[model samples]
Target: MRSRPSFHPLSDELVNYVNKRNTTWQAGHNFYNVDMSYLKRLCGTFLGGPKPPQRVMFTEDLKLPASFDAREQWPQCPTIKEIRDQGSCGSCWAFGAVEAISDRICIHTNAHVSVEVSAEDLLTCCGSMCGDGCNGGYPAEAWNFWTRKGLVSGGLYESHVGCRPYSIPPCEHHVNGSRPPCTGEGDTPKCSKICEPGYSPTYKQDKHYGYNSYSVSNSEKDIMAEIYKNGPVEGAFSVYSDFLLYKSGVYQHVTGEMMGGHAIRILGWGVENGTPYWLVANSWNTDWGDNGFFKILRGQDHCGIESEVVAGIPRTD
Candidate 1:
């Protein structure tokens, strides 16, 4: 039988569970008030309600460098935006797509586009039919939504001056409320196509910012090349209980139960301790893990990280 760690501050049942299963390329830690329940909601993935649609997977096996990091390769690229906190809502799918698209837009426009695409705008305006309404949604569906309905520029969660302010804040971040964020939207939120107060009226346009095309791929080399050529890619991966307590290192589901599908941004890839891992940006905020970022076992498609790698091309013309 496997033994628990010397200092186990997390759940004994969960921690001991991990110890017994497998201890290869995986580790867990207590990251804030997040547990299984909160993570499932935050990492919601449309409950496998069928992806939006399919696109050309990949043509050929493109060769990648020994290690690829988008942020490091792009010099003129603007500094990455702030880390996001999705509160208690399952709008992560929207956030993931928007963040990647925003970064690529900045790269394509040479940082001329100063505004961050609004996740709140998509999550709320997408309607329950499009997405699960703060419960969960598909990132690919989010891309399709962006293609059909261009997004308005906006800032972080709960910020004004965008199309609309984020109704939700960080989960249990400041004050834990009984109701989930933006719960009172008894009526479905609509995409007004108008920038919120503080944002100029004619300063931005709806269809001005979006992708010309997007593709889905699972090949590691293909994903690396896409990130190097574009900005970041939106991806979906399995989230486990051990994933919540992830502190550092190349993460893999060693212990804990399967939570569900979670969406994220695949920014770059690197090698650590001779182990290769993909660098990802999360919506859990900076305090949650490795300064709001985490590394997962790379190439091997750890936890299905490479399962769905979607990249967008900005219509820069």
Candidate 2:
């Protein structure tokens, strides 16, 4: 058996909770204060219950398209310039949307712009259209905003560095003869401005489904492979039962005290002892998962891995 690392400082309560429940070590730290009761309902809708397929089962050797290049696929994968850590901010939806957009931009332009989109911008602007700012959002809604409003190739700028408030640059591109406004303050004005352009946004379900227990296992490889084939996969892991006990690190899923909601990007996968595992990119700090990434068991659909595509790219060719 592969030795497992002890739970991180942030996951102590979560680990204990899962252990007491006699569930697998798949418990997660409630980094985002998600409602487990609601999440359980959501999972049940997709997987037929909270406890669904939680193991690896690869029926065929998955094949990648000829255009597949593990390295070139995501310029952000290995380069620190591309991959960003949101750092305790509930802006993962924005990051995931921007990450995919960055990849698409690279694939389309064949250039790495290193352009940074503003998560705070989206959070404050995209009100009920996405999700309540500070709550969450869907990737497709974010894409619609980018297509119509156009984004700037800018980074966060704070007058006083070191964790002070920052301002996002204006929408850099004028598309359809209009400039989109940046929603900085806590209001829906920006979302209203963007939505006025007759852009009807919608959310697409993810094809793969699965759950996360928080312990490193072989199943992570399979999930990673699917992620490689698809653009990016959405995953839900268990978190702390109490919103105040949120932290980072290996989590125990049995903690019935579930709280918070988190979404991660699965980048790739590999194997050990012929067992598959998933390579996931997390929004938490690098010290959290495997350097901002984690390996979960394959075949076990814990985080609703098979629930259609949560977001997808339209075929332009």
Candidate 3:
């Protein structure tokens, strides 16, 4: 993963177009020196990945206000958590699935009640059926994994006592706030079939949670209504080269290889400079993107953002 090579003039041209669009967003060469291969791993999503089951929830009568933010509506609720760093692993699929679930559980319980579920669990233990640990994975398969095997909570701080924590550590390199060449990604930590060692692996967290059902749809309004009523939803979208430099404003893919597919949590929707966009939470640490989040063109499903949307009722105990 040395500084790699510049993606020809394509990346350069994209930089210019995005800035000139006045689209309320900006682009840069965050991973300018990296190769598209490594970049894809960091932005991993399953290709021909597992799709969600058919819809069973009734949404015919649901309606969203002109606009709403789970953060504002439940200001007191743990509707949002700090942006988590996926380091260099291609595990956005894992983060996207869990982040939405965590926020929704907090919204429902009125507390940040559940332990941060272990991405390591799904990444490693879920086996080939779910996805490659750091190669790529599917959000739908993650939901299926959770349904089959209730999750265990774990994260950075929890890793100390071997609690169900994020088994992997953040990459120890840096440019400005990103991992420098050949060192951004962390290794896939060993999957603990149980909780942190010496602690009865029988963790004191919500060990199992699964909705009675899951659903998917391209109806932008339906997704909005789902987020409005329940919580964030996991969605997949195409990532173009220009997306790397995303700073603010509404993002519309400008240029670059159809790098690969990626997943994230759609928090809300709004218009910036008359450009409607979906507000999304990414797994990349808060230092990246629009402070660990980004917005994309809405309704049009740019980059298949509308093509694959998934949601489920959190089975809170």
Candidate 4:
């Protein structure tokens, strides 16, 4: 096999810091107190957020037909328009929601809708449906918010906006706006916060719009087949040890690493040398790993993919 690339000191530092912090908390904490927003900030730069461009990822998960030099894969893979990163913003939930919406719109409308949704709207307005801002949240919850609030086709602003109580001003294209009825922060408050006027009925009614979960215990072919039938899939994984050092290229687990938290989204899946793997988009940046995409070994104790289906949309004939 090719000699392993030299390990970067920064990578080691990051890995060690995450390890120590996790260990310290794991001692008593019931969950992995490690929040992804903080982790993104700690990484710094394109590795973090406040990214560039606006569009990215347009087709089904694209992968190499055959193993080629690592250098070749970068140029060959399908391109996604770049988007501005939301620095230290726990708006990945919003970002993911918008990203999926944007991609779908591009596919269906045959026109790119610059309708940027607000991350803050999902965090604060969505109430219990979404998690606290800067903490993290689920995409399904945000989708439910859109269905109820009737999102506006606008762009992201720098901060919150409008006469609404949770509004932030000087909104930038990056700070896109969403439909109102946004519930404010705090996990406990979410339940009640989403019920007020303007909020979606699902939130007010405490009903799931179109929530679906799947097991990662199947073959990659089976998973992809399901994904083909469905749209995008949200799932968790045990981020391997070397995952922290991931700067680019397809990923494989390293030794001395432990499982972390759940990450949503599975754009596609593929295989190499007879080993099946899943192609996943990350909230991290292109500089992180394979230009913001990584491969997870299939049927190898990884969470694989969890699908959250969107309802009210036309079904494939």
Candidate 5:
């Protein structure tokens, strides 16, 4: 029974219930005015509503650290901190897949060469293999696409830093913000192989490929080792209504209904005041949930978070 922390400049009905529960984390008005139905659309991943079996990686001599964060471990990899927004599209499947690939590319290269795998390419081009683009997709299939078809380099919306920039525009999910509000789900962009105007490389020339893609064993140490040795991994987990309002602390679903399944980048893990948590990067942009990141209860496969982890090594050459 943890006592509630003294901190509440503003609160929501969901937050009130969460704070009262003897949960590991707290919630607030991150999605204060956002409609539940609208937010539900963003919980896109495993659209078939059936999780395909993944081959868990096997490891021996498991010596784990107390905590690890990909950002801190590989500070040179800017992609680790580049928390991206999926906009109104449910292309979280693409974001998680590409974001981790980008980080691993940078990390594996010892930060000498960095690249952003195009979510636009994965979202639109993979077709049925990756699942219905924005509507939802499977994390494992995205990795398979990376290994088989490869993905082009692309940065955030309008960044023009990569070959194919994300077509979707960033919008504010909350009630009020500087950016325009997210109106509704955007249609999955048409698959295009051409690079953006003025970009140096052609679409094919700019592509990055994955080598070996596999799922980490369900064991926490296995998941931690995968992240520690490689970079970040893409994972899909059940998202409850309470998860949307997550602000700070290690989150454990306290209240609210199970909304949908969400795919995210599992970057690292640590124990917070005796409570273990998996540090995750969400596709909701920096304005939401601890600057586009959140820590969820770890070690127990909370909400099946540890069930379907997927990742692969990048083909740097």
Candidate 6:
């Protein structure tokens, strides 16, 4: 077994070391000087022990484009351009699932139904059915929760644009401003039925529901077709020590201990210098990776990125 890197996970020594060994990606000052243990808490997405839930697989063959981005496809959907910060909570499960559902609603309804899904609602309201709130949760269950119990419209922290905006404030250690530095894991928020003051619709009236939810087959082509047909998809992958320092380029874990499973949104795919990659939107604030987005090796199911994908269609009717 490989030993844990003696150097600090956020130190320049480890960053430089990873950069030297990795050709596909580069490590940078994004996460430098931060505690590695703090990074570990951020990598939270429990897929129910070793075996993930059995998901349906689609085997449709079609000519696919070389590169595609959901942001470009639906410019009117402002949520696609937004990058949410999970702060210190392990609620990536809610963030990714909520984001995909929010995007799909707009995509399927031709932007007429543009709305944000409350991660706060899904995170706290779903109880054990989804996961343990901020501690961690199941991405798939969040989708199922949407169908049975609809989510209210909500935006990022302090955005005041939804029935229930995210309660956890952003952790901006790398940046200087009013935002607080990263600290202990955020506690799970309590479920509430009331909407934010001044919001037009009541919590019940603003509820958005999904009609159906399913997992995309591990096949790369199938995953691509799903995103093209719907919108983005929620995926969980094993994060390593090296990924915390990712800067740019197609990322494939080079070295580091298997930290934990982290969920993210996969919006598009492309080929870079003959290397195919899936464009990903991370829950970390925009200062983290390549402007809150990064690319990972596609088609190979690297780190189980393609294996455990979940999505759902909005109930536009």
The number of the candidate with the highest TM-score is 6
Model 2 collision count:
56
Tens digits of per-residue lDDT, candidate 2, 1-317, equal 11123312235655556445543234444322222222222111111212211333345677744223334566654332334544323455566555544444443334443334444445555555555443345544544555444433323434221111124332221123333321212222233222112223311111111112111223434444444654554454434343223233223233344444455555555553444444456554453334455554445554433321233332222
Candidate 5 segments whose C-alpha is farther than 4 A from its true place: 1-11, 47-56
Best by lDDT: 6
RMSD of each: 5.7, 13.2, 3.3, 13.2, 5.5, 3.9
Taking the tens digit of each residue's C-alpha lDDT, what string does model 4 give over 55-172?
A: 1222456443432221132222212233324334445555555444434333333333323334444555676555545455555556667556633322334322221122332111
**Residue-level lDDT tens digits of model 3 in 127-194:** 77767778788888888877777566656533453346675555422444454443435566666666
Q: How many Å off is the CA of 207 in candidate 3? A: 1.3
Model 5 Cα lDDT, one tens digit per residue, 87-198: 8778888899899999989988787888888899999999998788888888878888888889999888889778888988876564444345554446888988899999
Report the lDDT of model 5 for residue 275: 92
Count: clashes, candidate 3 = 10
Candidate 5 clashes between residue pairs 3 or more apart in a chain or in different chains? none
Candidates ranked, most accurate by TM-score first: 6, 5, 3, 1, 2, 4
What C-alpha lDDT does candidate 4 achieve relative to the native structure?
0.39
Report the alpha-carbon TM-score of model 6 versus the true structure: 0.92
Better of 4 and 5 by TM-score: 5
Candidate 2 local distance difference test against the native: 0.39
* Model 4 weakest lDDT span, ten residues long: 24-33
Range of the 10 consecutive residues with the lowest summed lDDT in candidate 3: 1-10
Please report the TM-score between candidate 5 and the true structure: 0.91
By summed lDDT, the worst window of 10 consecutive residues in model 1 runs over 1-10
Q: Counting only residues 3 or more apart in sequence or on different chains, how many pairs clash (N, Cα, C under 3 Å) in candidate 1? A: 1
